Amino acid sequence: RHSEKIAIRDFQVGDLVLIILDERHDNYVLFTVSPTLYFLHSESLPALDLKPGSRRPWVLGKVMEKEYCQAKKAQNRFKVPLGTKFYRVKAVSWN
């Protein structure tokens, strides 16, 4: 409980993270002070009780994996330009 504080950068396995809906990018992201987008991995949505697509505004999660990615087409599910680098993060519920 004392170690339950939300990480804000350099996300590591085991970090507590605040996962928030980002309407502009049509996806859940991690709250961060990084300039880089950290998207929630699509495989993590069911176990966080989240849905694809009135979506729940936030959940608290625990980081399981991080993956560095780059958009290869101008039209993509993350609504970022061609060449944008971003992360995908797998997370499970903090509870």
Binding site: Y68, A71, K72, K73, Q75, R77, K85
Partner: peptide, 10 residues
């Protein structure tokens, strides 16, 4: 696919 067309791991 469409997904791996859109983005990749780097």
């Amino acid at each position: 696919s469409g997904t791996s067309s859109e983005f990749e791991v780097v």
